[PDB]
Amino acid sequence: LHSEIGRLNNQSLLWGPYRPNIYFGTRPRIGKSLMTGLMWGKIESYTDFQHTVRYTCEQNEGMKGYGWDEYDPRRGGIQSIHDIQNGLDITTSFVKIPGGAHGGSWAARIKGTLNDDAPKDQKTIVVFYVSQEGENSELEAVPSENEFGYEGDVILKGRSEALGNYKLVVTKGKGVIPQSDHDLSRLRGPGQTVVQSLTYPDEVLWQAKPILFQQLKAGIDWLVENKYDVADPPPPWQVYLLANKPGSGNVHIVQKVFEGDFEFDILFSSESAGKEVTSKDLEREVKQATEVFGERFARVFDLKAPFQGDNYKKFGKSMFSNLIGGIGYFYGHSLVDRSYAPEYDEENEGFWEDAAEARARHQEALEGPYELFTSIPSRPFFPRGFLWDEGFHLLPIADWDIDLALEIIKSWYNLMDEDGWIAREQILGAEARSKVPKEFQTQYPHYANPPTLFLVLDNFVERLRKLSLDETLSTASVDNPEVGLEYLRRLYPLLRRQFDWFRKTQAGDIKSYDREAYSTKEAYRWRGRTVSHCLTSGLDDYPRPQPPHPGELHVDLMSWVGVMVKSLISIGSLLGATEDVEFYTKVLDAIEHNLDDLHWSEKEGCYCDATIDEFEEHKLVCHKGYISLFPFLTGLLKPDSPKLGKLLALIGDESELWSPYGLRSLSKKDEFYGTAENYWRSPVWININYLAIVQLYNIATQDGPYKETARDLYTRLRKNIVETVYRNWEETGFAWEQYNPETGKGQRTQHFTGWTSLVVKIMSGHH
Ligand SMILES: Cc1nc(-c2ccc(NCCCCCCN3C[C@H](O)[C@@H](O)[C@H](O)[C@H]3CO)c([N+](=O)[O-])c2)no1
Numbered sequence: 001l002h003s004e005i006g007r008l009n010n011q012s013l014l015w016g017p018y019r020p021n022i023y024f025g026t027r028p029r030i031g032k033s034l035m036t037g038l039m040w041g042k043i044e045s046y047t048d049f050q051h052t053v054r055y056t057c058e059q060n061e062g063m064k065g066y067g068w069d070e071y072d073p074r075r076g077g078i079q080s081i082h083d084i085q086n087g088l089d090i091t092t093s094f095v096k097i098p099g100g101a102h103g104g105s106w107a108a109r110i111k112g113t114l115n116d117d118a119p120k121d122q123k124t125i126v127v128f129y130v131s132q133e134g135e136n137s138e139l140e141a142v143p144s145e146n147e148f149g150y151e152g153d154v155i156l157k158g159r160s161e162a163l164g165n166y167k168l169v170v171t172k173g174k175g176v177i178p179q180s181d182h183d184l185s186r187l188r189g190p191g192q193t194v195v196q197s198l199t200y201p202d203e204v205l206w207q208a209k210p211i212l213f214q215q216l217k218a219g220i221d222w223l224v225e226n227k228y229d230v231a232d233p234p235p236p237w238q239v240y241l242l243a244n245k246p247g248s249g250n251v252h253i254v255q256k257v258f259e260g261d262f263e264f265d266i267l268f269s270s271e272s273a274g275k276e277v278t279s280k281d282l283e284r285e286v287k288q289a290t291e292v293f294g295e296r297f298a299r300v301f302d303l304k305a306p307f308q309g310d311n312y313k314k315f316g317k318s319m320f321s322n323l324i325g326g327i328g329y330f331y332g333h334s335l336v337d338r339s340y341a342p343e344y345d346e347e348n349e350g351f352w353e354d355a356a357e358a359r360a361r362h363q364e365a366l367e368g369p370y371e372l373f374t375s376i377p378s379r380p381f382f383p384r385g386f387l388w389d390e391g392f393h394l395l396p397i398a399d400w401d402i403d404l405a406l407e408i409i410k411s412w413y414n415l416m417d418e419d420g421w422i423a424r425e426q427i428l429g430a431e432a433r434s435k436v437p438k439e440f441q442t443q444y445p446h447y448a449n450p451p452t453l454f455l456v457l458d459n460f461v462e463r464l465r466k467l468s469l470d471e472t473l474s475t476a477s478v479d480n481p482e483v484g485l486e487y488l489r490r491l492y493p494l495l496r497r498q499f500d501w502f503r504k505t506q507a508g509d510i511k512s513y514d515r516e517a518y519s520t521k522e523a524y525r526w527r528g529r530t531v532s533h534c535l536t537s538g539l540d541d542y543p544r545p546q547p548p549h550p551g552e553l554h555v556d557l558m559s560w561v562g563v564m565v566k567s568l569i570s571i572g573s574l575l576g577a578t579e580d581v582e583f584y585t586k587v588l589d590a591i592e593h594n595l596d597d598l599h600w601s602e603k604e605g606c607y608c609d610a611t612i613d614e615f616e617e618h619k620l621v622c623h624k625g626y627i628s629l630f631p632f633l634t635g636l637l638k639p640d641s642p643k644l645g646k647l648l649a650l651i652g653d654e655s656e657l658w659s660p661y662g663l664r665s666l667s668k669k670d671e672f673y674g675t676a677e678n679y680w681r682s683p684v685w686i687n688i689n690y691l692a693i694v695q696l697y698n699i700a701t702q703d704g705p706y707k708e709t710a711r712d713l714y715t716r717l718r719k720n721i722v723e724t725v726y727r728n729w730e731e732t733g734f735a736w737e738q739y740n741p742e743t744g745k746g747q748r749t750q751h752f753t754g755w756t757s758l759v760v761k762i763m764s765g766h767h
Pocket residue numbers: 059060377380381382386388389435436538539540749
């Protein structure tokens with residue numbers, strides 16, 4: 001039955017618009033298969049379309065905004081695009097229709113409405129680009145009856161092992177199609193939908209823009225050769241309309257030119273499903289998905305006071321839809337240094353220079369291929385899997401669809417190598433690499449990242465302890481305990497492997513110094529630190545001991561290990577791994593003492609990282625900020641702890657961390673406040689604020705000395721964080737990466753959905 005729910009999940013999730021790196025396209029969760037993508041741009045001149053055409057996601061002055069209004073990867077959703085440069089408001093509605101044996105069918109409507117500023121007679125070029133990867137697969141455009149192109153629908157018939165037989169139709173659509181009276185129309189037709197069918201080696205089919213442009217350029221060269229010139233030139237839109245040449249191939253370009261508003265449908269019909277998909281099917285399924293989206297949201301994200309209002313609901317739906325709408329499927333080779341150069345052990349003083357030397361040997365090579373099904377932080381700027389971000393992404397997603405979240409966790413854990421390492425940044429395949437400077441591609445097997453995916457696991461466990469097919473599937477792994485347990489049984493050894501990997505690779509040094517502590521074992525240091533940075537910790541430029549030193553100990557990292565042990569206690573217990581649970585219990589107890597013995601500063605009233613002095617002694621290095629609160633953020637302190645009460649004072653202290661807009665990453669009193677790139681040195685970050693909010697709530701709903709302080713801080717922080725993110729969204733249409741504690745303004749990158757979307761769960765409360 002676990003096998004059964006697994007196959008049903010597989011069938012349910014196979015298809016999607018799983019290409020979040022582009023405005024709109026689809027692909028199934030199969031490395032080498034059928035992919036589609038949309039392009040559009042106005043044409044006003046002989047040279048502008050190369051500059052106006054849209055395909056991969058960006059964010060700049062020419063684009064007001066874009067995102068998902070509703071989305072559920074089982075059903076589909078609706079995306080809105082507000083394009084200033086091209087004077088166009090676009091809608092792309094996508095819907096899946098279950099049936100057959102190959103993951104069902106799907107359809108999309110693309111609608112473009114000119115904005116008030118656009119010329120009423122704007123010409124817009126629209127391209128639907130289709131490619132298929134695989135040795136023994138086929139795809140063919142059925143020729144039109146007409147001479148120069150298509151009066152009606154374009155039909156592609158294809159086949160593969162993975163998809164069986166299918167047809168993909170691009171409907172004629174609605175809107176004025178311009179007609180040219182030029183001589184060229186004798187050979188090219190007056191203006192109509194055209195199809196070019198081509199082949200390239202599989203590995204380059206992703207390069208849709210260059211492939212298209214190569215065809216456009218060939219058409220223009222033909223014009224030149226055939227005496228179409230500046231004495232009497234055809235109109236731009238005709239110059240840029242491909243000669244119709246449908247056929248068989250692994251690439252199919254479908255091109256339309258419209259004047260004024262337009263729309264057209266894409267209908268993917270899985271043959272094994274029986275009756276083919278129609279436009280009327282599309283409209284019905286679109287209306288139905290919205291209704292279901294509506295009903296689920298009100299149940300799962302029921303926003304509590306003072307956010308029950310409709311403005312907050314709309315806000316919540318946008319923040320949530322953009323988060324879950326970022327889910328992509330990525331496939332390909334990854335770039336990894338597998339030298340395990342000894343310099344990477346960072347055992348000496350000045351280790352960063354040695355590590356730089358090893359990197360300069362450039363032993364990294366491509367490996368895999370790997371696949372990953374994950375949500376992402378940033379469609380325009382970094383549309384790919386980041387390991388600790390994904391822990392935050394799945395907290396709202398798990399609420400929505402626990403089985404989906406478990407799928408993503410599983411996908412992440414399937415990357416883990418024999419040692420227990422998962423790369424923190426997953427750049428899979430040439431398409432993903434295109435977005436990343438080559439200097440920043442290489443992954444390092446000694447680089448960890450916070451294990452926030454365990455937080456998601458923790459939530460699943462509590463749910464496990466305490467309808468349409470889609471509704472049923474979304475909770476099958478909780479509603480069927482035996483299913484849930486089997487999932488944990490299979491994941492459990494990889495979690496344990498990761499635990500062990502942390503302790504083998506990210507170990508700090510007690511025994512070699514004048515260091516006394518309850519445990520001789522429990523001490524941690526993040527590998528990969530530079531003079532100015534600690535990227536692996538996730539808090540890039542939060543101030544750390546200077547200089548970096550093999551004797552450093554990082555309190556956040558030890559806290560993370562505490563998170564992991566507790567999770568392993570719970571899961572171990574569920575699986576009756578008695579021997580394991582006894583070991584975990586001893587480790588937890590040791591971390592509890594050692595956090596105090598190695599990291600607590602009585603003088604400062606908070607936790608601090610530690611180094612080793614010029615005189616070879618243990619020194620605490622305190623920089624009041626997120627790092628300082630870590631045992632609290634990660635749920636490690638008892639509710640009656642005096643230490644907790646001191647952290648609550650720091651948290652609430654306006655002159656240190658407490659801004660009107662949320663908690664400051666670093667205190668105003670810290671010498672490093674607002675210095676350098678000021679990334680984690682003052683701004684308000686939603687992910688850490690979310691952990692604070694949840695821990696304040698835990699203390700607030702339990703007997704103890706800080707109940708009432710916690711309740712007040714919970715109330716205020718929740719309000720502050722929600723309102724800041726809301727005001728910004730209202731003003732700008734965007735979720736931002738971080739928020740300015742003086743002004744409240746969103747800054748750094750937009751489209752950060754992205755853990756900023758946690759705000760949905762903050763609003764809905766009841767932790
Ligand atoms: C115009 C215009 N373009 C841009 C622009 C900005 C940035 C980038 N890439 C930066 C990649 C680094 C991701 C780290 C983010 N974040 C940092 C946290 O510190 C981590 O904790 C966390 O894990 C990760 C992930 O969330 C690109 N670009 O490469 O295309 C373009 N801005 O304006």
